[model samples]
Target: PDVFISYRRNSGSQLASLLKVHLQLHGFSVFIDVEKLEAPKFEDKLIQSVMGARNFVLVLSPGALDKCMQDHDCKDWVHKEIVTALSCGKNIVPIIDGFEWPEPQVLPEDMQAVLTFNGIKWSHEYQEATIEKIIRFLQ
Candidate 1:
């Protein structure tokens, strides 16, 4: 796959779906999990998808990382996806939608790498232009 999307359902689910559609229209193969939460084997499947994709697009909304920060050993799927992508050296593109970065010291050491990558700000009112920027960056 060309791209994999990792997002929190409560905040980024809609944008992730929209981005997947636009990305596919532009000739990029995209993988986004649309399964029932906690389905058996989902984690393994998600990890494989992340490993297979060339790019990892993270949809970050306000408080997106709060859960991870509260539980350093969190088994949150978002946390796992980010760690896996970083460890595998995938191209991580964070789509920041009204999100602010937390201090590095607050996050687990491995998860802190997310703060190092530059990200694109996402605007609901200007989705087309934002997607264009993302497409250009990926290309």
Candidate 2:
């Protein structure tokens, strides 16, 4: 199983990398995108990964949300990943970043059940327990 870490490249790469290292230290290296993904196989690899992986961590910032609403193309990949993960009964954790338009708590009820998410600190600073929260949630 894997954990797909989703983020806007320009916006949340630092946060993603930090979590990647932590997940790696915790014996989850195969799920890291840099370790797991490359451009040529991006879409098929992602869809297959979502189905096979145990979790998908979406770094949901306000800008990323707006981008989802605005860009049809992003839908083909990221938005599709979210929908597919949910449809396949994969756990989707929305790791919200600094700004919040639709706060994680405020995400549509349609998404409320599965996302099963909590807000990280406003600075994207995570407590050690969060990793345990994630591990337990995946179970």
Q: Which candidate is the best by lDDT?
A: 1
Residue clash pairs of candidate 1: none
Model 1 lDDT per residue over 7-86, tens place: 88888788889999999998898874544433456767777878888899998888888777856675877888899899
Off by over 4 Å in 2: 34-42, 70-76, 103-127
TM-score of each: 0.90, 0.70
What's the TM for model 1?
Answer: 0.90
Model 2 TM-score relative to the real fold? 0.70
Give candidate 1's error at residue 119 in angstroms.
Answer: 0.6
Model 2 — which ten-residue stretch has the worst lDDT? 106-115
Native-to-model Cα distance after best TM-score fit, residue 19 in candidate 1, in Å: 0.5
> Mind giving the per-residue lDDT tens digits that candidate 2 earns over 1-139?
4677777777777777777777767876436654345354676776777778777777765576544553444443555666667777766676766645554444433344544555453243455677666556543
Quality of model 2 by C-alpha lDDT: 0.61
